[PDB]
């Protein structure tokens, strides 16, 4: 969408949240594919336990990705954009998309995996655009701020 929406507000999206899992690297196709597979395996196990995966709302902006409980609108994760190293869609499953965020708590890389019926590609592009705008602001401040 426009700069202004990402820059001045946020873009909301609905998704299902398969979870997050620790990875060894901040990027890479293999890394994310191994994570998505791990979390698909876990989800399948959980479904055999009678569990649904949770629905979440994502708010994407130049400041980050907020993961909300969609009914309460209560923030469950705030992934500051400058701690997100990589975002990708899954070339062999349209609905899957992911990002890698370096954890506040632990120094570990966490890959967050999600499912969107219609918007996976669009969501991934939106986070890419956020990266682009935030980096341009960063350069224009001569490397400073937050």
């Amino acid at each position: 969408h426009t700069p202004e929406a990402l820059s001045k507000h946020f873009i909301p999206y609905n998704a299902k949240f398969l979870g997050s899992t620790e990875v060894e690297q901040p990027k890479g196709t293999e890394v994310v594919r191994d994570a998505v597979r791990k979390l698909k395996f876990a989800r399948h196990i959980k479904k055999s336990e009678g569990q649904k995966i949770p629905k979440v709302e994502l708010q994407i902006s130049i400041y980050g990705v907020k993961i909300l409980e969609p009914k309460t609108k209560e923030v469950q994760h705030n992934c500051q954009l400058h701690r997100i190293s990589f975002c990708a869609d899954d070339k062999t499953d349209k609905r899957i998309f992911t990002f890698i965020c370096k954890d506040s708590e632990s120094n570990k890389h966490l890959c967050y995996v999600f499912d969107s019926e219609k918007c996976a590609e669009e969501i991934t592009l939106t986070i890419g655009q956020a990266f682009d705008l935030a980096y341009r602001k960063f350069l224009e401040s001569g490397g400073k701020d937050v």
Binding site: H82, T124, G128, F131, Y135
Partner: peptide
């Protein structure tokens, strides 16, 4: 189709 965040490296 993936994107690296250029800003990341400077905040680590």
């Amino acid at each position: 189709n993936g994107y690296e965040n250029p800003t990341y490296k400077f905040f680590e």
